[PDB]
Amino acid sequence: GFESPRPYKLTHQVVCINNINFQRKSVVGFVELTIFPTVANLNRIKLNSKQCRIYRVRINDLEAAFIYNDPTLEVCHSESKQRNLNYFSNAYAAAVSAVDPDAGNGELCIKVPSELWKHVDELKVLKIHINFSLDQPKGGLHFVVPSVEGSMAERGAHVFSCGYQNSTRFWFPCVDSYSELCTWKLEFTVDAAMVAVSNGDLVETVYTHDMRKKTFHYMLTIPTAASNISLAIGPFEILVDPYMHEVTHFCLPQLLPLLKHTTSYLHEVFEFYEEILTCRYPYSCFKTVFIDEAYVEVAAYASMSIFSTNLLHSAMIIDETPLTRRCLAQSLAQQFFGCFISRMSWSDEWVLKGISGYIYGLWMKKTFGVNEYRHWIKEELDKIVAYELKTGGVLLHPIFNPASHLHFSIKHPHTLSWEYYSMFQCKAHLVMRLIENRISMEFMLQVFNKLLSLASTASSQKFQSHMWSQMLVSTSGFLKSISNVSGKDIQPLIKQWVDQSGVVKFYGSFAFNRKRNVLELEIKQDYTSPGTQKYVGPLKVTVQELDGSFNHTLQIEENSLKHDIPCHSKSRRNKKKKIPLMNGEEVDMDLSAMDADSPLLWIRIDPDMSVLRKVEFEQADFMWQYQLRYERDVVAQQESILALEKFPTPASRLALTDILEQEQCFYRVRMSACFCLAKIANSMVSTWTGPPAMKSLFTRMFCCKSCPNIVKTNNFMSFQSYFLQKTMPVAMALLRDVHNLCPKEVLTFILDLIKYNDNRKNKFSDNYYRAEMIDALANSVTPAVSVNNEVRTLDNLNPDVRLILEEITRFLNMEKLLPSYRHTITVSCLRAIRVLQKNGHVPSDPALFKSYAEYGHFVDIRIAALEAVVDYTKVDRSYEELQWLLNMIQNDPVPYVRHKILNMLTKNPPFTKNMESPLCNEALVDQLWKLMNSGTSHDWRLRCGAVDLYFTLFGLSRPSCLP
């Protein structure tokens, strides 16, 4: 049951936009809302509006009086001397709650005229006609106007609606909540050479009487929220999908072949999401818009998605096809379960984010294989346990503070830190995988189909929300639908992993009792760490003995420590028979390293990742080597690679080398075995016999049979030896001689890989392989032996580093004339120049990176150069570079770059709270408090980034370096 927090119900909204002026960056328009009051004596009506100048408001064609105030413009007063962050977080939460449409509130308060009170008490319709104007919007709708001359279509100027969550208040007045569903009528009067893309279906396109402008009329009969309404106006090249004909793809001019190749996969994504769920795609059209200077890499609205043009690749670009493919896939998953089925509160957001991430993981499983699915699930679980042990924990479904261990309030999406938002979505889809583990996948897809079918029977009624609230899901409704389809309720699993905000830590060690033939496990939990919680459920453990692989369920109550499980025979060591594996197959194992008295080959605690856990198991090194070689699970091979770094014995070198030589191993395991072999080789110097590690293996796999030092000409058509070939010198460059310097046998090998590179014969580009070669050249740089702080001059230039510097100069200059893909070699060469500057080789001068960060280099070039400037101002304690970065945060045209500068200055801070630095003035505290209070008031993501930066630099209390 859904009861509105608003005293009115909104039925229909007309959004008309005229006079989109690109020179002056200005729009004019009106908005006409059709509300039905649910309570009599409505009097004031409270709507949401930011940055719009409200000209006049007429209610039922009668002139009404409005008052506007935004408390989130300046959160705390300018003349308050408070400088602690808890004060700002409480004031910011109160300010966002005072404009919240999820309460009854709002920023624009319109007073109902007196003569309509007899029209409002007996509950009859009210039609509110606001007309407004955006004069020059800061972060409302992004105007990308290039400075080439010509007409606005000839120079490539466009507008798009940017922002996250409820940010539609930034460009027209609305009820900007996900729970106020209404039908829509959208008119946009644009130039005759431009096209206006928006939500709904385009009913017509009429000309103006001078035929210089045309009006696009859109209609949206599926009741969506105001937060799902978008807009993209530009000189877009239109491409109808040749497979599905209601899907149109819009790109920027001169990028039509890239659009043709890139969006050619999307019909398979449509077919997948419509056959695992049994509902068809709910909207009547689908539109993909590719734009410049995007807010996020992929945004999903109702019947529309806005991607950045940096996803567009051609047919000869690999290492970008899977990333763009999965961006399209998660936009479509959010089309199904973020835009059609919406949110009932700010709680129950974990339901939608979990269903979107879970069905996108099912797509990844079918498309890229079960092994890529397991690797992705393991990397998300590691990312979560790292974040939750780092700071507090992520709390899905809080109850309204519920989480007081962290420096922001979780009551609203616009007060969350961006890393918390990312980890929120990540934990939501892993908890949905856990619900699939308890209640099987076919029942899970039946739950999702039951939600979609209720929403689509709801979506066709005309009753103003008598039935339109069946399109809003809640937690209680989701659990009730689960209990309807399965008969089991998941309330212990919901109580543990949703309502409780923690992950578990397992420390395991075993001992084999030879007398009674049992395996005594010893599993203890660390439940006193700040991020942890105590697990009391069951726990699966998989033991591989000589007779095969056996699963055991252990009951781990609070007082439990020793778990005795039984062991089988050892009669497959009496005769040589094959040892049967986890799957149905069996292999020949070399049992010379195994103990004579124990049959068990390896043990895995929680193999299926059925809890949110971090396992620290203490096996013997031969058990880790057997688990690396003969396991049929990629997460166990990865964890054995990760645990073999502590055992540098030559049997582990043989194990990793046998993994590296082995095709029919998953390629991301061999790419990890490269770096593990490099670390082991560095640890057993003065024992290593022959050549450096992986060199003979590289010449055996990727070089000519007649010439060992000449590499084969590039043929990248295998896509697994391409990735292994481009990752093996990067790990090989981490080799170090007893003198702690990279050997001149590996550096010469990398330089010969660079010289003899011929790419005139493959059908794929070479930009990522050459960029990884520059990364391998950067990995070999050891710190220089400066004497008496000698100025870095030609005489003290290392003879090794002169070759590296010549190569990166040649590569960067050739990129200036023949540019690659993603300026990947520019990014790699800027990263390598920063590596050479971090050691004492090149003079520590930020002027090169400051010229590449000037608004104009690839956004990738820009963020690489700004990363180099952030690293410089951390190491050299530069005041003027920090003022340069803070000025670039305040006034840069691209808001993604501002968010990225705040993000990089949070990750690599110039000082922490513990450090005494010269940069801890009262002036810097006043600048950052002014940046939290004012200055970042227009983005909701810059303000949370400024809160994160103030927390990283000065902590939760009063800045110490202050009177």
């Binding site: 290039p146 047919a315 670009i317 580009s765 100069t809 960067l812 540019p819 104009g856 690839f858």
Partner: peptide, 25 residues
């Protein structure tokens, strides 16, 4: 300037064009 000369870094108006765009196809 005689030894190791670097071409100076020139910013663009649309950096993604020069970047992503393949040049040999």
């Amino acid at each position: 300037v005689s030894t190791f000369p670097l071409i100076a870094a020139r910013p663009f108006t649309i950096p993604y064009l020069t970047a992503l765009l393949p040049s040999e196809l």
